[PDB]
């Protein structure tokens, strides 16, 4: 029937946030901080004042969401009175930020009615005579995303020039910095701090469990009457949220003590609403929550326990022997020779008490050994993983490490999973379970 698909599409659109900007919801715990952003940004597109704020809050804490809600709320009327310059702190390095501002000043003033061209000096001067220099001007709203990379501990030239065209300019600017560091004012060089308006507004977090169930109530209820089922779907929702002993409130309660975040709940709820096929099926699927434990089991299906569960028998004996050898050493290192000199000893003690276990030769335990470093059960001795930036992953791509030039069975590996954590997770009905004690 084409009656159920409208309800499902409306529910998933509310769950993604892709509504039109008149029924787009704002949760109650972030309605005060949306008022401050609305106050700041509404006295720069209208009153043409200039200032600079920094939004501090963790990841998925609704900073780009609130800012795009304002910039789509200040566009239904005052479309022609502002242009937006959005730039990240990841995809815009401090030399490629100038080309970003020049390309986004050029193509935005085109859509209203060549500054992109030249070298870096000519482009940086072409956008310093444009901004640093009854009628109404045009304001520029700068959106700096992850501003804690432009505030590096060397120069801070882009921040000095952007915060310097706040006091000392004729063009009204309003620059938003979304970051994640709580110690963001300690980053700034002491002459970029003096140009800064010092108005850093911290995003709100969830203080109560009532805020979370009110947020889920705001997200899943339906306001516009599109499908015939909505008159049930609201009420059958509230029966799950008012009763504090149901499954949905219990999953919200265990979300409040774990990762205290609404987008994890959104990614839980979305394949529940989208895999359902009928309205009664959706109703009993949100009654029982038959999917928030299928999905939540699958999210842990291979970390260090759901893929050790899928180990084979020789691989398990090799892992147990290697953890025994690392437990016996001082600092926790071993190699293939010290591991195979425990596999054959353990299996000879298995065949001593008794029908048996076939001892695989060291020509076939090499494949097992390579299959337990491609599942991350062993690391090397001091091998750091992925490097932090892109140059340190280049500086080491030209280095020829000593741990890869020595022969294979002498590389000093290191355990990912100690023998105590191996004792409790192997079932007690195993033929090696007694061998996890020491």
């Amino acid at each position: 029937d084409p009656g159920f698909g409208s309800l499902q599409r409306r529910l998933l659109q509310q769950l993604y946030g892709t509504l039109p900007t008149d029924e787009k919801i704002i949760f109650t715990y972030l309605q005060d901080c949306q008022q401050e952003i609305d106050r700041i940004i509404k006295q720069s597109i209208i009153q043409k004042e200039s200032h600079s704020v920094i939004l501090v809050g963790p990841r998925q804490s609704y900073k780009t969401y609130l800012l795009d809600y304002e910039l789509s709320l200040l566009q239904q009327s005052y479309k022609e009175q502002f242009i937006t310059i959005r730039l990240n702190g990841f995809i815009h390095s401090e030399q490629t930020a100038i080309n970003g501002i020049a390309t986004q000043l050029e193509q935005q003033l085109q859509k209203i009615h060549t500054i992109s061209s030249g070298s870096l000096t000519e482009v940086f001067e072409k956008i310093l005579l444009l901004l640093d220099s009854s009628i109404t001007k045009i304001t520029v709203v700068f959106i700096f995303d992850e501003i804690d990379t432009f505030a590096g501990p060397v120069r801070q030239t882009l921040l000095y020039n952007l915060f310097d065209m706040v006091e000392h300019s004729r063009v009204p600017v309003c620059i938003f910095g979304c970051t994640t560091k709580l110690n963001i004012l300690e980053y700034l060089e002491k002459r970029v701090k003096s140009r800064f308006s010092q108005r850093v507004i911290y995003m709100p977090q969830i203080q109560n469990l009532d805020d979370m169930v009110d947020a889920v109530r705001n997200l899943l209820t339906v306001r516009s009457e599109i499908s015939p089922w909505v008159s049930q779907w609201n009420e059958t929702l509230e029966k799950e949220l008012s009763d504090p002993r149901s499954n949905l409130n219990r999953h919200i309660r265990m979300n409040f003590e774990t990762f205290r975040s609404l987008p994890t709940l959104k990614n839980s709820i979305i394949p529940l609403v989208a895999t359902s096929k009928n309205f009664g099926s959706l109703c009993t699927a949100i009654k029982s929550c038959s999917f928030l434990d299928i999905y939540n089991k699958n999210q842990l299906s291979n970390n260090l326990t759901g893929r050790l569960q899928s180990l084979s028998d020789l691989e398990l004996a090799i892992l147990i022997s290697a953890a025994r050898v690392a437990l016996r050493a001082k600092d926790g290192s071993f190699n293939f020779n010290l591991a195979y000199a425990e596999y054959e000893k353990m299996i000879k003690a298995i065949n001593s008490r008794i029908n048996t276990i076939k001892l695989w030769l060291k020509k076939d335990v090499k494949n097992v050994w390579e299959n337990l470093v491609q599942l991350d059960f062993f690391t090397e001795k001091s091998a750091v993983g992925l490097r932090d930036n892109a140059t340190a992953a280049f500086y080491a791509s030209n280095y020829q490490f000593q741990g890869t030039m020595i022969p294979f069975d002498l590389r000093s590996y290191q355990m990912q999973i100690i023998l105590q954590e191996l004792r409790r997770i192997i079932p007690k009905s195993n033929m090696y379970y007694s061998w996890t004690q020491l």
Partner: protein, 54 residues
């Protein structure tokens, strides 16, 4: 290599089931023989089946 063996050996007591059952039995033989060697990897079984078939 099997469809020339059925005529090299003068085999007339065969049908398609009589080929697919020995194929599945060979695959189960490689599995119960070599699963403790490889692990749960389809790629390390595919090439063992490719080697030990003819």
């Amino acid at each position: 290599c099997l469809r020339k063996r059925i005529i090299e050996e003068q085999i007339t007591d065969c049908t398609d089931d009589q080929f697919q059952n020995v194929a599945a039995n060979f695959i189960h033989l490689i599995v119960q023989a070599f699963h403790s060697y490889t692990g749960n990897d389809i790629f390390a079984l595919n090439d063992l089946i490719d080697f030990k078939w003819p």
